[model samples]
Target chain A: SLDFDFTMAFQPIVNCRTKEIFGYEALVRGLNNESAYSVISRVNEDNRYLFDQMCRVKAIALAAKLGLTSKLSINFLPNAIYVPERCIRTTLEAAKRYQFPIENIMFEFTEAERVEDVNHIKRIVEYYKSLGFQTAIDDFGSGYSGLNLLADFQTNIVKVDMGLIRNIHADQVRQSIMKNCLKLFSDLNIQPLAEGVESHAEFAWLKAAGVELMQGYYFAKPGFESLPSVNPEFSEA
Target chain B: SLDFDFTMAFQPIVNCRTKEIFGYEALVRGLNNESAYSVISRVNEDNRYLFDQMCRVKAIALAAKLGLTSKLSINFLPNAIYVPERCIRTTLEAAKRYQFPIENIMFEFTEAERVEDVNHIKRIVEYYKSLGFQTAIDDFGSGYSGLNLLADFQTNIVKVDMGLIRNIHADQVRQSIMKNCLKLFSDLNIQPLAEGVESHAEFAWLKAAGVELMQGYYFAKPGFESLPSVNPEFSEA
Candidate 1:
């Protein structure tokens, strides 16, 4: 394991209709308050396993310390996970130590990863689901096998990619595509969450399209070492 | 480009709700009544380009001979198409020779392919659309780039892979997935067609799910050198 240090930040993903926080996605941050890219860019195959394990434990511990009662979403690297059962023990132990309900913990893998072995990732997703943890595919549309991955296995939630939601209100074609993304996830019995919603227009249109959950600066930016509350303005919008 | 000659079998994609014929998808076959695999397997990087061009002209010519008035769907190889403008001359010429309206011809590329160049296919779709031809992504959920391709370029129609609709009546999960697929395409302003519906049960549920266009053995098998009528039993059922 490398000697690099990293910490956690939390961002609330909220339900617009209910005006309640659905969950908080745990984002990575450097010790000196650096961007995630600063920390993640150095991760290679040599240290990915350690980084992934470290992130899981760090996020859970930080979330627990912040008194996070709602669901906690953690990003995962499917390729770094050698075996689901073995890689998850540290995460499980951290959750148990913090009294975080297993069901309230969610694991997210980005669609951007070049998943060479799909069955391996599918097993990881299945193992997580079996242990009562919610599973989500993040950055859903900005990936290699967005539809094929779902065809092979179903997940608990899907976060629409930021590229798809950014400035959606100004683009009719994008609005139409987002509408279908919502409908696709809804019919598949999966919760569709909009990501990177920066304006009231994006949030409003997504909500109108029946998107169940949303996250971005429109609600609250990723909080550094804290669980930022949803803005009242979002509810009014 | 191999020694084997290629022909086509026409299968009707019908609209049972309106009891009308939507179109006929031209499935490639061997000249001597051989299976499509015999011809398709011989196609490679070396000969795919020529084979693709040949299929288009032959399909249109055959459809014209059969006095087909409805839409004619032709399977196209995206990789085989080098330049949409340059390669499309034969297809346009064939349509003119046969008195077939460009709008009545639909070009479909299988979602199963990796699609080496998305922009290339986008050009093909856009060019075809400009010429008033219908465009479709075939075997949608069965491939690696179904969602990715759609995200890049919007097509006129999407044919749901048969695997998803197979035995969907008895399976709630499958039914839900198909329903979502239909809803997703509909919201995107793209027509959704359920393919490979081999039973009255599949037809009934697809109809209920608002899938207006469909193709399968339940309606009619691929007719050899002929345009077959859709079974009346489907509308009644």
Candidate 2:
């Protein structure tokens, strides 16, 4: 159990083709709006399960209160989840209470940690999909299990790791790599979300590469307990 | 330690740009030239350590007897190695006895198995490099820690997984991913070897994509207890 309370900051994921906001990813923050590092770095074996559960409830509640119309993307820890059916009640109840459609809620699992058991996460994905929630793998290329997880199961979306996206337009090497990854995502019928877009060059290159969804500082910084709007300049593209 | 005897097969990884043989990857084989699975599936937890050590010795000896002049790439199990210094004595002795150049030996570990301790493999890589042996990560994209391992410790070579290379010419998605990966490898100053190439189209694409080294059925199949020649037609390409 965590001793302190936590909150979320919403950052929008934009769709380039339609020129509309796709969804807002709820990033974790502290009660006083401290950086995610301050909050996430403190998590351990003891309180990960509780913290994960709390994140879902808080994200859903906050998104509803803000009257967010688009999708609400909430990050979850797969290791923290015990059993999908048993542990997802709070999330379901929160959605029902807030009148948020289950289909509009997205669950993203960060690929940083090793999923001890693939079957556990497999059941989580199946159960979540069964409930109509869009599932995704976050920080896709940066983590250990992203590719392996994709091999065992499929997800609706994959957020390209920021490492690959940074200065992609300037680096021909990165361009080659990301272009191929996006093509792969398309081939698999999975939507590719290019995250951490910081410059016009990146946006232009990503657009040219046929990437549909994107999220990063170039659009808008995450809002504190609110849904941030995409910048007009970026939105026009 | 194993009830069954194991031998090795040699498969050439060639430089398409230079049209020269880069090295031969020593693949495990059964005494009667059965599949590697027939030999590997029999090794249990009890004999894994001993079997791994013996594999190093046998691979070097066979390559020597077969009059191999190019680099000899041998597969190793990181988990089987308790301590690199103590565990590598036989490999050192085998290289000396067989008069194989220590510099020509490349030890490859597949990313399929999760190395429990990053430092264990780190030390092995460092120690192996210290002893003038090259290090490589096999099945690069298919493993859990391919990128993580690269970040934590650097290796001399990376063999792109076969899954990514299969039908790469026709698959725009695969082409994009592999192009970027090759660029990434080049940027990192590590040699990239594409494995499991089976088609001329795949080879042509890889060659045009600036892939330096390659091995697959298109080049030549593994030769039992012998060094196979690359197909002259494809070798010229």
Candidate 3:
């Protein structure tokens, strides 16, 4: 069986901002003989909380080994809130050991599994914020509280649901909604980060629509070793 | 009864921490017909929500007159959340009109009523936070949440119940508990505001315990107008 190196596979996700390898999200890619989709799907279907907790801790360790001081935004499962002590304490300890400002490391939660024990989520996030760690409620707008997440989660950033961004120019309704939402977030002082800008056209449309920050293939995928400067003044296609 | 001019009585409290006065608590001193305590008790017993709604709207309007840009904190009755939209919308519209940060104003929720709508509370608080408003879960220990109010309310400030502080010197258990609670709040990044500090000894004890902020009789008597700073440093023995 061939060997797969997690560190090698994860090298590309360094901060696109500084290109200094802020942190890498340890996605469930199979190394050697393991099937990544199988691993991840299984993790999602079962032991999701444990799998997510382990992944975040590993992400921090990996980032630390790579000498990243900025922050590593780690993927998290919503169910992690149920395992309060294990998930919160371990992540907190790892953060302290690395001396990373809590605000620097962002825990990204998606719109799956209706959050039960919501107070737990608030408590955990507040605890992290107290230590200067940041939180991002990712895939916002994908579900019930997408727009409301900013008010509900106290999140530092909201990664727009990519499905809403795909082919947005053709979808006038979507474009209008996105524009209004961006304005709302701006009013609320929440940063709106659009993901999945794979095309220059999409990027242009978003930019003109007043979407200031973005992520996607067009911007060069993570693991590019060095992130390219996004040209501030590119003509729309 | 002396003419209770809302203008003269509330000019100062309306704008706190800023030159702009939004509104005051409008301390309702009774006329010759009734005592202050009697009025408060009577009003509180009859229609709590209506009384609070009136106070809140008046506070907002008064704040508007004083040109207070900061959002005012109105005391909410135990079951105020159950009241109709008249109260919330009135206060909100006033804030919107003034271009005041909605989040800057607070609704001081007390102990008698536990927040009935958990998700609603989260949404409203998040909405407030998004709008630049701040909220305090006032009378922390007195509520059913007990010390859990910190974890429960997910609020910005916990107004530590005065009942505990009033007896700290005479009781060792109370002193220890208060110290621990203060430390916990500090750890959680939630400020612990000590209420009802009556003696210089109580003030010194709280200060020595590293309780950085407090509000009490020892500090200043609550009045319709602006309160002179009760510099915690100088104790009235």
Candidate 4:
């Protein structure tokens, strides 16, 4: 099978409130893509999990290659929590050897799928949280039980889905939903992060909404290129 | 046919940031003998064209009796804009006579129930804005075009509806949506006002979400009595 051009797919997570390059959430892009999902489906689902593990592995390697020890966030699928022990061990080993700080490695979980069995999901999440590794519910609010999962699972961060964040600067319904969601997370002492932030207007909007961490195209497109400096245009705190 | 105690019905509004007294958005509450919808239905619906004009008159009359001058937000039905000329003139006269600061008065309109014709609504809203009267889009995310209402109206305030805010303090799905909504409003230079704040936990949650203004029951119950002093238990910006 032809390889997907993952390099063309990553989006950097810049500090909207601070002018510092933090990390990136690597997105998978396929070549001559017939449809986005078709390409995603082509990859072995289990291998895809391994790829995410690989991304974190390689990201830290790149960070070290660049001599930057800044905190970084890595995306993980919902099922990644249930990975076989060997896979988990392999991934953790790389993370440890690279000296990637648990506080620095944000494990982002997509909300598209949920842990069918709450007990199983709970065990995995609790385990990760205990490791001092920051847990995040990514693509949050984009799918069903998005909030239910948040309530069921404990995490350190919540990434607002781009479906809702796109053009949100001019949209109130989207903002209202985001504000309420942030309130819920903040109650749990979790920080809310807005994803898919695309412009100075959108960044300012999210900052005023009390969002601390942000990820979006306006900040940086995903790539191994030199990380862009953080832009502090509209941060209140 | 019977006396309705408007006092126990609506919650009070407070600037969550400053902890200063803003005003109350009078909520329709059922009396000991009636249901909410039943009461709203009896309000001269036959002359629906004048329904909003009449409600403004009644609300102001009640505000006068209550000795409330901080700012009264009156909810207007869809028909209020039918005769924008009369409705605007009436509300303005009462506001002027009471020496009510134009900036202080907020006209709450149900985006769900408001007229579908955008131009008509815009004309009246622009007039109100010109008069120094602030506008607040109510029931945000409750129906179609909720965000559109906020974007198109050019109002000074946007009230995130209670239905949407109900479980936001505890739910991530709700939190995600609200984060983006608040950001959008803040970007537009419009303040976000969280209505139906009923618990201390919610107050804290919303405050952290950058929702600087709030109205709810935990702070105070609506009544003809004197205004409530800020709750010292809560922190204000």
Candidate 5:
């Protein structure tokens, strides 16, 4: 399990309307900023619990040292969480060590990975929220139970998938889909973050489509073991 | 991945209503009849493709040699399947060598594992069904996308999970849930099989509940590298 080591990357998520940093999502990068898959390939059923635990501890520790004031969103593996109260002890301890406000931290899970139980996922989300931590779903509509999940429970944020954003500016079908998704999320009172915005057109379209929260290369690419800032133009006051 | 080897053990599934053999579900076992976990522990993202392919080839070759007439159900990884057509060639070749009818082979995948894409899984299920192979979902309600999966498409068979089967003879909640599930499956025209039936009471209760097909230790414990027959009493006329 101790066979390898990895570091964290921070990509800035900005509120287009508020002109403020909404949060920084912590992503796993191998040493020297190698691709995440290279480090993630080493994970299996055996070390997954350790991997999930270390992921939170490292992200919290690094975010604290980097003087992160905006929200710090950490991705978690719902499958690895054996018991919510027990599994969260390390994160809580790490937060205490850094003096990071628990309210400033968000735990995000993705449907891109298989979750052992949907009910278990719902319970985890509820527990984290009850503990005063932010909860979110990443890569919405990218994998299993995307809409179904939204139907069952609401998370603080749902990152609209890159697959829907790739040519969204030119694709009216996608625009219609995204527009309705934005509406649905609003109706549910859950904030929707448009992720993987790469081009100015894509950024322009999303902003015009009533989407305020966004993250992608259009603003900033994830930094290697460092916090990346949003481009000046994108973060204008 | 070459660090370990695995063999197959098949346990019989029977149709209590028809008093006929339904099929044998091929399960992974270590060389010395070790638990499936012993061999499965070695599998990582790096070797999953090979693992899925080899599983099919091994099961087919062994089942053929074993002279199986009843359907042979092989568990698969939808995530590991790159292209259904291309990936199925090895299986086709194996079937040809053994003179096994394609219709006699049922590809059973479970919701217990993470599937990268639900649409991709649907495509695979449709493709296999089109090519004359049976398809099924194992461990319904045991993991992610259980009800959502049923909402999307119907497979030829769905294995009602052991969690629902355990104590159903005494648990009214599970009995009521399964009763409605039986109704739903019948409405969809898909066969439902009760798995993990270890007690006579559970078997009798499910049989009375109108579950025609069933599998479990009550029928026969899986034989190591061998095919096992259903216990005579449980498979009675």
Candidate 6:
């Protein structure tokens, strides 16, 4: 339904403990490599369902086309996803068509402040996880997320907001918060991923604290419609 | 602005470590000692500003009248509070008139989902702190709160949501979350108070976690328009 076309940039969620690529978060971008704001801010009531369906379809198509074997993390609009069994048919079709495995897909909650039924996001979580698709709470600890969301229902992974991750090496308070949050994640049976790790010190701090998965610019900025290379220098950490 | 009159209920916030009375929370009640739901649900845009002002005034007067020397925590609507430097004059007047100390008052954010400029709450925090008033986040970790709040501005105290405290001793995951949350409170220099401690088990679990302050019916139910007495047996914990 969108007159304009868009593409996705894949950012790696790395497992520093093993130095493996855990997954790639498909961040939407304009066709000319513009920021996600241009694509995301434009979506509204008229074609909400179509836009999300397209996002799911395109990301899966692109992942296979790009020769991706790692998990693909795609963000979803909760309101756009009702009757997910029926809504996600196109997605299953896309995956089947592209030969991508269902379990390798992670559906992340972009958590709109104003959602139709925050509970359905819970239902969505259950449906997704119940069906073997991974679910995640993205940009956690920022305005977009809170413990209440986790309190309601849980996803397999929580992408700790980059703001908390940024400069955490020097910030004692950030260290304290993250240190405890990491402990909580482990206890809650949830994997904590630090997003936007831009510094070696941050990566080291998070790694030393024993965070499971991390996705951020410190490893590699998302490539425009491509998989950016992770520097061995950064990856070796 | 409101035709109907309301009263106040003071619930003790106990200091388990020292076995002393630390504070009392001023909960709003109707004239006949009706539940907060009756009074609160009636407060809409028309009477919003006045309701909070009256709440501030009545709590200070009642606390002073009750001859309470301990701290007094009062919930205030962020939307009702703007130009606090001027707005708080009535509150200051109430304190002065009642001979209560400004330092003894705590303004808790009953964080409504829709606040005008969540930023002002930040400014309010700075102003309140700058002036020797204590600021607290009430019902934290429930639907009412998240870390993003503390992420924006620091509050002196966080009233740990009872949902997190309820049966925490029996729930391993709850214990894990609260254990880390308590650690976070200490490191962040924010006092953690466990509310709704209905059972002896819940009290022991929170105290063992080293929480400084606590309030709940386990000690004593809130006396209508009165300061409830703390049971020595429970207080000694």
**How would you encode candidate 4's per-residue C-alpha lDDT over B84-163 as one tens digit per residue?**
45446777787667666667777876643433576677777777777777787765544332543544555777777665
**Model 5 — TM-score against the truth?**
0.54
lDDT of 3 at A183: 59
Stretches of candidate 2 above 4 Å error? A1-71, A75-97, A101-104, A109-135, A142-237, B1-3, B112-117
Residue A24 of model 1 has an lDDT of 98
Interface Cα RMSD per model, in Å?
3.5, 4.8, 18.6, 8.1, 10.5, 2.8
- Tens digits of lDDT, candidate 1, B75-180: 8774554754766788899999889999999988774344446677788778889889998988786554466577678888998888778888887667666766
Candidate 2 on B212-237: residue-level lDDT in tens?
79999988999989999989776556
True contacts kept of each: 0.39, 0.23, 0.00, 0.00, 0.02, 0.54
By TM-score, highest first, what's the ranking? 6, 1, 2, 5, 4, 3
What does candidate 3 score on TM? Answer: 0.42
lDDT of 3 at B144: 43
lDDT of each: 0.81, 0.80, 0.55, 0.62, 0.80, 0.81
Model 6 compared with the native: what TM-score? Answer: 0.87
lDDT of 3 at A191: 73
Over A26-118, each residue of candidate 4 has an lDDT whose tens digit, in order, gives: 444444443435645666864676555655666566555555566666666555454444556766787678776666766776634334634
Q: Order the candidates by lDDT, highest first — what do you get?
A: 6, 1, 2, 5, 4, 3
Q: What is the lDDT of candidate 3?
A: 0.55
Off by over 4 Å in 5: A1-237, B1-4
Query: Per-residue CA lDDT of candidate 5, range B169-228, in tens?
Result: 997556655766676677667899999999989999999999988999998998887888
Better of 3 and 6 by TM-score: 6
Error of 1 at B235 (Å): 5.4
Which is the leading candidate under DockQ?
6
What shift in Å separates residue B31 of candidate 1 from its native position after superposition? Answer: 6.3
Report clash pairs, candidate 6.
Answer: none
Complex DockQ per candidate: 0.25, 0.20, 0.01, 0.03, 0.04, 0.44
The alpha-carbon deviation from the true structure for residue B124 of candidate 1, after best TM-score superposition, in angstroms, is 3.4
